[PDB]
Amino acid sequence: MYFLKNCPETARNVVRGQMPISGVKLVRGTGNYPTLVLDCTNMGSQFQFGEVGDIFYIKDVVGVKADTLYIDPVNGNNYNWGTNGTKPIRELTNIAKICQLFRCKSVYLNAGESVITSNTELPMVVFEGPGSLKANSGSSFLIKAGGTLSLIGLSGISTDGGHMFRVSTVEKVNIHTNCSVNAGAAYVVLSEVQGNIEYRQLFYSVNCSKYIGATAGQTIAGIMVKTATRPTGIDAAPVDGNVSLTYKIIE
Amino acid sequence: ILYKTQGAVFIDSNGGAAVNNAYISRLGNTNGELEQAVYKPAGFTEVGDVAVTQFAGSEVKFNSPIIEQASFDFVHAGRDTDSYGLFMVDKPHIESSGGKKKHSFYLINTSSNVTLSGVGLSGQDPDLDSMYFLKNCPETARNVVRGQMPISGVKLVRGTGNYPTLVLDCTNMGSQFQFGEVGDIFYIKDVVGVKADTLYIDPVNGNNYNWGTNGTKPIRELTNIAKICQLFRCKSVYLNAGESVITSNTELPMVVFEGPGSLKANSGSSFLIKAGGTLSLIGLSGISTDGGHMFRVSTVEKVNIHTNCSVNAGAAYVVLSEVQGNIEYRQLFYSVNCSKYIGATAGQTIAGIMVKTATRPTGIDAAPVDGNVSLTYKIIE
């Protein structure tokens, strides 16, 4: 419908009214700045039958919501909105942005491994589904906002070497993992700022050198690890020296 | 147009057609409510003259029409097959002598975009008359309202069907919270740019037709308080004197509750906590249940429960986590009674607890929570 060619950072291409009844591909473009705005647009059933095209070009959304973002690394299509179960997207690249725009409460991961090869932000929502999450090429999942990130019943999450969650926000961060977790020789959580983190591992299994660490100046954290399958050797020292514990619940 | 039964009727293919600055009026109000529309959609069964009727996929653009003395100003139905046909009205000037009117916008199986110009009204029947009547509008439909509400109080919406579709898009509400009525809050899907600080509840004198956001017009039941608070971004709920009760599980917004009223969960129901934040009960005459757990938490986000009033959960718990929760509960003075402060249905919930009152079940100071809850901190003398 729209082609945004080199629209400047300050420009806005506002869309109001009602979308066509039949599905359409909303936008495509060229240029380094998103400018399309959905201002209370009546999307009809476009989430189910249409496509966004290129999500990069959407600047902001007002009055349009969706409860869940669906990902399918096998049968997904990035042209899709991703907010309707029958039209899931394929990659994780823009899931933080999409959840931000549509105020999603959860992300559903269909069967298969959803992978990242460079640092990618995760929205602070509930992740569910049979899929798994993987950080390759020594990348990390990024936590840039406060709230609670929950991984529930997933096939697991792991990295091929890098720290699993890099926290760059000073707001209260809760990490709730109810699935298998494996950060290998790295940490499950690395605070890159003077953080405030609560981490809780519920059942399944967890592996890491430290559950939580920080690059420098003291980070406060609370931790609960409820599972027999853990690095029992760090029960006495679950965090690095840059982290101070508010509470420790293990065993 | 000066008519008796129907002013104008637009049906089927009228793509791109326009009706600008129309002046449609019935000649007087007398017996207008008895006129029976001749050309109408199947979905319109009411009796009363209709100024403008539209159906079968007709989507004429109505710019600044002036509609007078009509029972129904506009009756519009989307196409039967796929709800096609946007109801488009920009700045209608609606008037009626004696304030006689049934509905201004009778929308059936459709979407709409209406901009108000501060002119309008709702009928004399304090129960059935409303500006909008939304009939069987599908889940994907949106009936958007922009502009300025009428200066005089009106009842905004009524409807039939299982899906909310009305959207307040930065609507200038004027003094409608104080003088008008929402009518049926169920039909409101979303609200943008419209806020209110407090929701007022009065189980004795309240009226559910009210918005509830103005102190002189409180609502009466707790059924939709969470929805209303979420829509208008309310910061607190004020409970007027008397007992506000629920008989089935009801969500509570995470805001401050104040006032002389009390909260009561009857027939075994529980209050539901579905979002993170802080729920505070300050100075109320008390909160209690007739047997169900007091607060059922279904969110994994951090939840703070602050009760500075009398709390009685009887043989049940004050808080039951239905998920792997993260809860902090603080009881300040007054009294508290329960079998356990916090419990969970399964796989460990973390909780912090402070109980500052001598009037508590001291028998559980040593074991304040069930086996599915692990404590982060415990502050009890």
DSSP string, B307-318: EES-EE-TTSEE
d(CA A107, CA A129): 8
Q: CB B324 to CB A45 under 8 A? A: no
Residue pair B83/B110 in contact (Cβ under 8 Å)? The answer is yes
Task: Report the gap between the CA of B84 and the closest CA in chain A (Å).
Answer: 7
Task: Report the gap between the CA of A137 and the closest CA in chain B (Å).
Answer: 31
Q: How many residues does this entry show for chain B?
A: 381
Residue pair B143/B107 in contact (Cβ under 8 Å)? The answer is yes
Enter the CATH code of domain A66-251. 2.160.20.130
Residues of chain B with C-beta less than 8 angstroms from the C-beta of A249 = 350, 374, 376
Residue B97, SS3? helix
Q: Which residues contact B127 (CB under 8 A, 6 or more apart)?
A: none
d(CA A206, CA B111): 50
Residues of chain A with C-beta less than 8 angstroms from the C-beta of B300 = 126, 148, 150, 152, 176
- Number of neighbouring beta carbons within 10 Å of residue B303: 25
Residue pair B275/B237 in contact (Cβ under 8 Å)? The answer is no
Rg (CA), chain A: 20
Backbone angles phi, psi at A125, to 5 degrees: -135, -175
What are the b/e assignments for A119-147, b being 16+ CB within 10 Å? ebbbbbbbbbbebbbbbeeebbbbbebeb
Residue pair B304/A176 in contact (Cβ under 8 Å)? The answer is no
What are the b/e assignments for B145-170, b being 16+ CB within 10 Å? bbbbbbeebbbbbbbebeebbbbbbe
3-state helix, strand, coil in chain B (%, to 5): 5, 45, 50
d(CA B89, CA B172): 17
Q: CB B348 to CB A224 under 8 A? A: yes
User: Which strands, in side-by-side order, build the sheet including A13-15?
Assistant: A13-15, A36-39, A58-62
d(CA B66, CA B91): 9
Rg (CA), chain B: 25
Residues of chain A with C-beta less than 8 angstroms from the C-beta of B348 = 202, 224, 226
Token code pair at residue A37: 């705005």
What are the b/e assignments for A61-97, b being 16+ CB within 10 Å? bbbbebebbbbbbeebebbbbbbbeebbbbebbbbbe
Q: CB B169 to CB A63 under 8 A? A: yes
Pairing between β-strand A126-128 and β-strand B50-55 as defined by DSSP bridges? unpaired
Question: Please, what's the largest Cα pairwise distance for chain A?
Answer: 61
Q: Does domain B196-381 have CATH number 2.160.20.130?
A: yes
d(CA A17, CA B206): 37
Cα B365 to Cα B59, B221, B334, B355, B360: the distances in Å are 68, 36, 17, 9, 9
Q: How many residues does this entry show for chain A?
A: 251
State the sign of the Cα–Cα–Cα–Cα dihedral B88, B94, B96, B102: positive
Q: CB B113 to CB A18 under 8 A? A: yes
Residue pair A153/A127 in contact (Cβ under 8 Å)? The answer is no
| Residue A104, Cβ density class (10 Å: 0-12 exposed, 13-18 middle, ≥19 buried) | buried
Residues of chain B with C-beta less than 8 angstroms from the C-beta of A151 = none
Residue carrying the six token digits 């298969």: A112
d(CA B243, CA B220): 11
Tell me which DSSP letter residue A92 carries: S
What are the b/e assignments for B100-132, b being 16+ CB within 10 Å? bbbbbbbbbbbbbbbbbeebbbbbeeeeebbbb
d(CA B193, CA B109): 26
Resolution (A): 1.8
Residue pair A182/A161 in contact (Cβ under 8 Å)? The answer is no
Residue carrying the six token digits 């009065």: B202
d(CA A137, CA A159): 8
Nearest C-alpha neighbor of B114 from the set A16, A36, A13: A16
Residues of chain A with C-beta less than 8 angstroms from the C-beta of B327 = none
Token code pair at residue B58: 């007709």
